[PDB]
Design a protein around this ligand. Structure first.
Ligand SMILES: *[C@@H]1O[C@H](CO)[C@@H](O)[C@H](O)[C@H]1NC(C)=O
Ligand SMILES: *[C@@H]1O[C@H](CO)[C@@H](O)[C@H](O)[C@H]1NC(C)=O
Ligand SMILES: *[C@@H]1O[C@H](CO)[C@@H](O)[C@H](O)[C@H]1NC(C)=O
Lengths: 116, 640, 188, 214
């Protein structure tokens, strides 16, 4: 549909990540969410009748979980990783794999919200 | 008078398991045997590994030992020899065998095939021994400039690394262009060096691959239609290209390339395929020799430049090696034995190949004489032919010619061979033929050799067994007996071909009798068998998904690896644009098997002038207490 | 990257041997995507042309892209922090398109170039950030400072190599000096 | 239907094996290992009971080429084919026995002929080499100069020829052009003829069954 699409996009603008963090980390996190949790969602929502209604409640739960998952990825990138220097690109690459993995797990779990 | 024989590979190797098969023909009771190896000249690298021979094994045994490498590194420019002196009871037999310095192979793998300055180089160095197993040795690596001056030197150990040594190098910003080289060599044997080439160039990745495949991989000189080349262009990710393509033709002789000015053409490609023809008038007028026949041998080359209607990207693709020939087939005698036996089938392995070099498929060959014989080639371009031989001493002049239909007789391919007869001991007429099937054998299926025999009825009771050996990759693999009851003239020995026999095994055989005035003699034979070239194990990669194909960028997918247990895989993913830009110096199983086969000691595909010749051709050394011993070898490579 | 990856696997097993799998190819492809085309390097202060190529692979759906070149403080082009550069193009189905952009590099180093698309009436986007090298105008030449033969007895030997003139050296450019040592073998 | 309840996963058949052999010369066994339902078994290691060190592996079409030598004796020969696939208990291996009587000559003159041949799934077009192996003592060896051979296909004499044998050799290889006319099988017969004993005419023959891909 289209009204559903506008509602979902309006909802993925409330998401906020800290600006003080490093630029490449922000791009990595935003690209991960935009490719694993906004493209399939937008595709699924586009295929609804206009009369069908969404359920934004656990979509807000989606947003709460994506804040938590980004927080864990940032913590693992900052100091948890030990095989390499902190704040370094190889630590980012090492953590991005499982960041996207839990992110796709979240999307797969939350694919049941989009209907009543 | 019992004999005691030692059979060992002709050239030994440092730090490897080398087998020495011991027999004691016509020996009664147990005999102690001790094998000791000493440096030549002088005198004790090893004197261990003694054995006790028993009639329970029909008096046959093997003693394996690994010679330490030390005196060995002092002198290397001149060949060095060791003496294998073994004592059978109170009788001593010794034989001097050559020792090489080569101890293993290093297969270098670089992820890409073209690098830009300021980009890191990631490469691996596999370390395997002559038997293709992981080994722990120390390597040295030097990375050469285009001119050939080392830029980086390093030393690594393969110990506890399972034979893989990942490495790196960040190319300096201000460097020379052209081919670079990486040379790696084992630390013990610095005179054998392995290498690969990676190119440093200014490039940006293309967007689509251009393929030019002519309709025939050659050009008939008397064809009045001209060369037929098809240019096809598809995007990298599987879509058709619309654009305009320029092409040009030239004559490539030796190393000088001359182009044809009247040949460049623009042939617009619709739906990603275009076709241009080089009329024979252009080919004749471009060259300064009007004699068309004198142009044979030289090769054409096609240079195709494609530009999209967008005009945003241009790609070049060149197909060289289009030979101008008068005959579409080339008959080779590489695999045929050069010596035969009077009064036996003489199996010919003709190798019909296309002019470019690829094997020919489904082509009928024939022998000019006795034209009643005719065959047809198998998958690998080898046609089994059999020619019966009269029992005569004259050399046999075999000529083979291709007899393909719808081809004029002035246009087929011919070749000639000289084959000389096996020479017995004192014209005793005691031979041995070892008939066998030769095809694209696959590991696992059995083979039935035919230990055919020919000797007078006066001595058919003296021979009761046939010894046989199997060379493979440079060392004896199996060595056993073959009992034959007297009065039986053909013996079939079922051979269990495992996957361990890749890619070829040089089966030999012999017996021993006493005849004429009562002098010992030995009669031998050899066979070369080609097995299909694949892994000794198995590995394959496929995709976990069974649905929702064409993954979008940024999407997880799971790839499944079906490899042997306990193994270790190493992965690399390369954009196909890189291979479009430079597709040379890749790594695959074919090159590994080619390198392994290029180091085999044997240097003739079977049979020989006589028994000493047969053994030396196989790559062995048969010496006995009586004296019948093979000829000495002191060169790493057999004469060309 | 929208391309065809070729994945090669090499086995190293202790007991069996060594394997090399046949290459396995996965063909990554999207319905509508940008393929920005850049030269390897563009010389500083000299105007060059950059093409954005937009693809559409819907079988029968005409598309309405809105490309855009975000501002970059390094280069110079029509984009500015106050005004944005937008072409609203139309892509016929199963057809490409080319958009021309002119950019003047201004500072050295490695600089990024990006274009961002946004389909109309559907909700599809694709932007590509590619980085190209910019180098100061000049050429690579390698003048030999000196060649000398070392002989401690015929010439110890205290030898000094004066620095080269570097008269034509381009400013703010790294210069590498290579020193090679090779012996002189004699025989017979 | 047809899911058979069995105590052995293989069944050994002797349909294709010759029921008669020649004393003192190779005898080619063609075992046909099949699944209990009837489908041809593939890649099963079958072996003979005696000299268990000899074994083979069955080809794709379901026949495993096992060769066992024979003593030059007139007594009937007993074959106990016994599969030995791994991951199966010795109570699970399928077993089978067979008795093959010896070829009987004329007047016990010890004349035999044997046509040793490749045994795989021949495809039309490629050539097959048959070995006209002969056994005869040198007393009467100058009397044989050729081997007549015939080809039986679908109930007709497809191609009858000759094979000249220059006296002095005991093996000659006759190349056969297996065209597409040979589908699916051909029974290559052969014979010669000499004057033996006190001047009595006699003939010695043999035959081979070859299966071509259908
Ligand atoms: C001798 O060769 C046989 C071949 O079957 C092999 O089993 C045996 O291990 C070899 N001897 C030694 C000492 O390796
Ligand atoms: C300078 O570089 C060139 C590469 O074009 C090469 O021949 C060599 O490294 C140097 N040659 C001279 C003449 O300085
Ligand atoms: C006899 O058989 C041969 C087999 O090659 C065949 O060519 C021929 O037509 C037949 N008939 C005659 C009269 O030769």
């Amino acid at each position: 549909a289209n009204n559903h699409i506008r509602t979902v996009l309006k909802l993925f603008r409330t998401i906020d990540l800290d600006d003080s963090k490093k630029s490449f980390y922000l791009t990595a996190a935003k690209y991960g969410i935009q490719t694993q949790l906004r493209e399939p969602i937008i595709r699924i929502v586009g295929g609804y009748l206009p009369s069908t209604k969404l359920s934004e409640a656990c979509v807000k739960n989606m947003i709460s979980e994506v804040y938590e998952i980004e927080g864990d990825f940032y913590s693992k990138f900052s100091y948890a990783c030990e095989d390499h220097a902190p704040y370094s690109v190889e630590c980012l690459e090492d953590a991005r794999d499982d960041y996207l993995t839990q992110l796709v797990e979240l999307f797969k779990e939350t694919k049941k919200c989009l209907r009543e | 008078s019992p004999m005691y024989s030692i059979i060992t590979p002709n050239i030994l190797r440092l730090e490897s398991e080398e087998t020495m098969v011991l027999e004691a023909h016509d020996a009664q009771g147990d005999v102690p045997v001790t094998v000791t190896v000493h440096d030549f000249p002088g005198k004790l690298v090893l004197s261990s590994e003694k054995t006790v021979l028993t009639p329970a094994t029909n008096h046959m045994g093997n003693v394996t030992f690994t010679i330490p490498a030390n005196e060995f590194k002092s002198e290397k420019g001149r060949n060095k020899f060791v003496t294998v002196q073994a004592t059978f009871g109170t009788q001593v037999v010794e034989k001097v065998v050559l020792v090489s310095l080569q101890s293993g192979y290093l297969f270098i793998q670089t992820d890409k095939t073209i690098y830009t300055p300021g980009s890191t180089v990631l490469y691996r160095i596999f370390t395997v021994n002559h038997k293709l197993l992981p080994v722990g040795r120390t390597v040295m690596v030097n990375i050469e400039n285009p001119e050939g001056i080392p830029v980086k030197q390093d030393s690594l150990s393969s110990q506890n690394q399972l034979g893989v040594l990942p490495l790196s190098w960040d190319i300096p910003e201000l460097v020379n262009m052209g081919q670079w080289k990486i040379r790696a060599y084992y630390e013990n044997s610095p005179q054998q060096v392995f290498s690969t080439e990676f190119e440093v160039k200014e490039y940006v990745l293309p967007s689509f691959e251009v393929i030019v495949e002519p309709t025939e991989k050659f050009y008939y000189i008397y064809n009045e239609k001209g060369l037929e080349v098809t240019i096809t262009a598809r995007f990298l990710y599987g879509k058709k290209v619309e654009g305009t393509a320029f092409v040009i033709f030239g004559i490539q002789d030796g190393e000088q390339r001359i182009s044809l000015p009247e040949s460049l053409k623009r042939i617009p490609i619709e739906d990603g395929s275009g076709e241009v023809v080089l009329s024979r008038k252009v080919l004749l007028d471009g060259v300064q020799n009007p004699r068309a026949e004198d142009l044979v041998g030289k090769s054409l080359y096609v240079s195709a430049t494609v530009i999209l209607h967008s005009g945003s990207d241009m790609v070049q693709a060149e197909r060289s090696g289009i030979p101008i020939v008068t005959s579409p087939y080339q008959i080779h005698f590489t695999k045929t034995p050069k010596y035969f036996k009077p009064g036996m089938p003489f199996d010919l392995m003709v190798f019909v190949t296309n002019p470019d070099g690829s094997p020919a498929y489904r082509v009928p060959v024939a022998v000019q004489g006795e034209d009643t014989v005719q065959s047809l080639t198998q998958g690998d371009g080898v046609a089994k032919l059999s020619i019966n031989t009269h029992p005569s001493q004259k050399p046999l002049s075999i000529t083979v010619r291709t007899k393909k239909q719808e081809l004029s007789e002035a246009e087929q391919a011919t070749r000639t061979m000289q084959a000389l007869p096996y020479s017995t001991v004192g014209n005793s007429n005691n031979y041995l033929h070892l008939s066998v099937l030769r095809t694209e054998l696959r590991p696992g299926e059995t083979l039935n050799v035919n230990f055919l025999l020919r000797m007078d009825r006066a001595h058919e009771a003296k021979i009761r067994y046939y010894t046989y050996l199997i060379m493979n990759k440079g060392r004896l693999l199996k060595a056993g007996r073959q009992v034959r009851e007297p009065g039986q003239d053909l013996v079939v020995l079922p051979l269990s071909i495992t996957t361990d026999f890749i890619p070829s095994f040089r089966l030999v055989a012999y017996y021993t009798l006493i005849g004429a005035s009562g002098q010992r003699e030995v009669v031998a034979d050899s066979v070369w068998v080609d097995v299909k070239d694949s892994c000794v194990g198995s590995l394959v990669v496929k995709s976990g998904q069974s649905e929702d194909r064409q993954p979008v960028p940024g999407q997880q997918m799971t790839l499944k690896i079906e490899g042997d247990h306990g193994a270790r895989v190493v992965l690399v993913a390369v954009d196909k644009g890189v291979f479009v830009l430079n597709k040379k110096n890749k790594l695959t199983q074919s090159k590994i098997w080619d390198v392994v086969e290029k180091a085999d000691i044997g240097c003739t595909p079977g049979s020989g002038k006589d028994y000493a010749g047969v053994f030396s051709d196989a790559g062995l050394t048969f010496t006995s207490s009586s004296g019948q011993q093979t000829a000495q070898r002191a060169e790493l490579q057999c004469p060309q | 990257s929208i391309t065809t990856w070729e994945i090669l696997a090499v086995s190293m097993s202790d007991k069996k041997g060594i394997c090399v799998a046949d290459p396995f190819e996965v063909t990554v492809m999207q319905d509508f995507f940008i393929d920005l085309r850049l030269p390897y390097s563009v010389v500083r202060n000299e105007q060059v042309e950059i093409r954005a190529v937009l693809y559409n692979y819907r079988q029968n759906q005409e598309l309405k892209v809105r490309v855009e070149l975000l501002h970059n403080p390094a280069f110079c082009s029509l984009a500015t922090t106050k005004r944005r550069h937008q072409q609203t193009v139309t892509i016929p189905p199963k057809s490409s398109l080319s958009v021309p952009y002119v950019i003047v590099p201004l500072k050295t180093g490695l600089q990024e170039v990006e274009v961002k698309a946004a389909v109309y009436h559907h909700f599809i986007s694709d932007g590509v950030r590619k980085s190209l090298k910019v180098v100061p105008e000049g050429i690579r030449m390698n003048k030999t400072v000196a060649v000398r033969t070392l002989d401690p007895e015929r010439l110890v030997q205290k030898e000094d190599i004066p620095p080269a003139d570097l008269s034509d050296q381009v400013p703010d450019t790294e210069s590498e000096t290579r020193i090679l040592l090779q012996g002189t073998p004699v025989a017979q």
